[PDB]
Each structure stands twice: as structure tokens, then as C-alpha cells.
Design an enzyme around this catalytic site. Structure first.
Site, PDB file in Angstrom:
ATOM      1  N   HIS A 216       0.754  -1.318   0.148  1.00  0.00           N
ATOM      2  CA  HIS A 216      -0.028   0.144   0.068  1.00  0.00           C
ATOM      3  C   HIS A 216       0.886   1.427  -0.012  1.00  0.00           C
ATOM      4  CE1 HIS A 216       0.168   1.149   4.364  1.00  0.00           C
ATOM      5  NE2 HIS A 216      -0.045  -0.010   4.683  1.00  0.00           N
ATOM      6  N   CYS A 217       0.320   2.250  -0.587  1.00  0.00           N
ATOM      7  CA  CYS A 217       0.650   3.885  -0.498  1.00  0.00           C
ATOM      8  C   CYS A 217      -0.399   4.565   0.279  1.00  0.00           C
ATOM      9  CB  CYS A 217       0.952   4.036  -2.078  1.00  0.00           C
ATOM     10  SG  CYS A 217      -0.430   3.608  -3.068  1.00  0.00           S
ATOM     11  N   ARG A 218      -0.961   5.532  -0.151  1.00  0.00           N
ATOM     12  CA  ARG A 218      -1.952   6.269   0.653  1.00  0.00           C
ATOM     13  C   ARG A 218      -3.172   5.753   0.194  1.00  0.00           C
ATOM     14  NH1 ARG A 218      -2.501  12.892   0.289  1.00  0.00           N
ATOM     15  NH2 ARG A 218      -4.594  13.137   1.729  1.00  0.00           N
ATOM     16  N   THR A 224       1.364   1.931  -5.501  1.00  0.00           N
ATOM     17  CA  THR A 224       1.021   0.323  -5.329  1.00  0.00           C
ATOM     18  C   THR A 224       0.938  -0.298  -6.731  1.00  0.00           C
ATOM     19  OG1 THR A 224       0.230   0.834  -3.064  1.00  0.00           O
ATOM     20  CG2 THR A 224      -0.636  -1.187  -4.263  1.00  0.00           C
TER      21      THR A 224
END
Length: 282
Positions: A216-218, A224
């Protein structure tokens, strides 16, 4: 010709159509809905495909790109942390790759809890974080590694390797070279941990839903998706899988925003070109 502007325009045309088709309707049967008044989606229009959802109260999806199996999710909300940790433990997660930077996590307005660099108790779950290695990825970008030990009465204790790109840059893509290095580190970390489970005779080895890298990223759709695309190109089983295939697969299995920005797609195209991998399906 195969990587020229005409081919790239056609790829974008196909992908844009798919994004539009997959846009969520109100109460869309294709997307996971919040059960009540608790927020599910970190971003209102970045939703979680229902059929591939990992947990009823997370924005998180199983994704298979060619042969490559992962979980892509949003950065968990504070209210989701206990469920997120249970997901990580039940999956026997062989690597957690966090692509939100330290600066972003520190930005209180973004509501991204620092759940993997410090220890804490979340409902019934107690988590211990320990620092391990640091691996340079190129361009000054650094992967900081950790182990997260997840404890809960009634559950087996599980330790999860973490790869955190603490200085992932803002408002720009990382290069194909950095992305390749990151994919290699994430895959290698997963292989080592998966092997430990296999050596212990874990039943998770036989379960297609388990032992998946979690990325995950934000929002779990930009950085991602760039990484998942690079990981699929790092998988020797995926000969002839096209860029069209990989992005369509990510979109149908999570949401139409996967590979959010043209700048991210540019990196995937460059990686594909380096391999002589097709952009389009014939």
C-alpha cells in the site's frame, strides 16, 4: 512501432474506457459498501472490488496479475488498524511494502497512522516493531526494513517483514530503475519468509488466499500499482502478459483507478519495452 506514440495512445484509449466502465455507482454491487456510519474508503471514489475483497471492513483486494498474487490496499484508517493487523497475521504475510513516505505519514492532515515503526496495542492485538536492514534502491531512495510481531490471545503470533520506502518522493514517479530494485527487494523478502513457512509445514502454503505480499501507498492505486506491475514483470512465469493485461487485471480486481497517473504508466511501459514485452493484445 510496438512502443511508439500510436501504440501508447491505443493503450491509453483502452485503459480509459475501462476506468469509465468500472467507475462506482451508488451502492454498486461490484464494490464493497461500508456496513454503517464508519468510514470504509479513505477516498470516496477509490473503492474496493467486492468479489476480491480481503475483509468486509477494509479497502483491500486480492489481485492476481498473470501468475503473480498480491494484496493491494489503502493505507488503513486509524479505525481499521485492528482489522488490518488481523489481515496481516491471517495471511501469514511474507512482506508488507509501505510506499507512503515518512513525511506523508507525519502529516497529521492525511490521517495515516504510524502503525509499523512503533509498537502498540489495538483492541486485542499487541504489535512490536523492530528495525532491521536498510537497502538503497537508487537515486538516493532508501528502503527501511522492519519486523512487525503481531500478538493476540487465541491466535498464533506472526512476524511480518516490512519494506518502507521512507523517502518516496512527492508529486512524481520513481524511475524504472528504482521500481525494478524495489520489486526485487519486495519479492526476495517475500521468498525468504514464504520459505520459512514452507519449512515449518504451514497450511497457508496450500491456500491461494494466503502468503500474499501486501502493498500500500496512501490509496493503493498509484505507487502500489506501479510496484505490482513491476513485480509481475519480475515473475518468470509471466511471459507474454501484456501491459494491457496487467493494468486491466489490476483494475477489474480492485478499481478503475489502478495505475492512477500517466507518469506511473510511463514507467510500466519502459519496463515492458526493456523486456520486449507487448503493450497491447492483438
Amino acid at each position: 512501432s510496438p512502443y511508439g506514440p500510436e501504440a501508447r495512445a491505443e493503450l491509453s484509449s483502452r485503459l480509459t474506457t475501462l476506468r469509465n466502465t468500472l467507475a462506482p455507482a451508488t451502492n454498486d454491487p461490484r464494490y464493497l459498501q461500508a456496513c454503517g456510519g464508519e468510514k470504509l474508503n479513505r477516498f470516496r471514489d477509490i473503492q474496493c472490488r467486492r468479489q476480491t475483497a480481503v475483509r468486509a471492513d477494509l479497502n483491500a483486494n486480492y489481485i492476481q496479475v498473470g501468475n503473480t498474487r498480491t494484496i493491494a490496499c489503502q493505507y488503513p484508517l486509524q479505525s481499521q488498524l485492528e482489522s488490518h493487523f488481523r489481515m496481516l497475521a491471517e495471511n501469514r504475510t511474507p512482506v508488507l511494502a509501505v510506499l507512503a513516505s515518512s513525511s506523508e505519514i507525519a502529516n497529521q492532515r492525511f490521517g495515516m497512522p504510524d502503525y509499523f515503526r512503533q509498537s502498540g496495542t489495538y483492541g486485542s492485538i499487541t504489535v512490536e516493531s523492530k528495525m532491521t536492514q536498510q537497502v538503497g534502491l537508487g537515486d538516493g531512495i532508501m528502503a527501511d526494513m522492519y519486523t512487525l510481531t503481531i500478538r493476540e490471545a487465541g491466535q498464533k503470533t506472526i512476524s511480518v517483514p516490512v519494506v518502507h520506502v521512507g523517502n518516496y518522493p512527492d508529486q512524481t514517479a520513481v524511475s524504472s530503475e528504482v521500481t525494478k530494485a524495489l520489486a526485487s527487494l519486495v519479492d526476495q523478502t517475500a521468498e525468504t519468509k514464504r520459505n520459512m513457512y514452507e519449512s515449518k509445514g504451514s497450511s497457508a502454503v496450500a491456500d491461494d488466499s494466503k502468503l500474499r505480499p501486501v502493498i500500500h501507498c496512501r490509496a493503493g492505486v498509484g505507487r502500489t500499482a506501479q510496484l505490482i506491475g513491476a513485480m509481475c514483470m519480475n515473475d518468470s512465469r509471466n511471459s507474454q502478459l501484456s501491459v494491457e493485461d496487467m493494468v486491466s487485471q489490476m483494475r477489474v480486481q480492485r478499481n478503475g483507478i489502478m495505475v492512477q497517473k500517466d507518469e506511473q504508466l510511463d514507467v510500466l511501459i519502459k519496463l515492458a519495452e526493456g523486456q520486449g514485452r507487448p503493450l497491447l493484445n492483438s
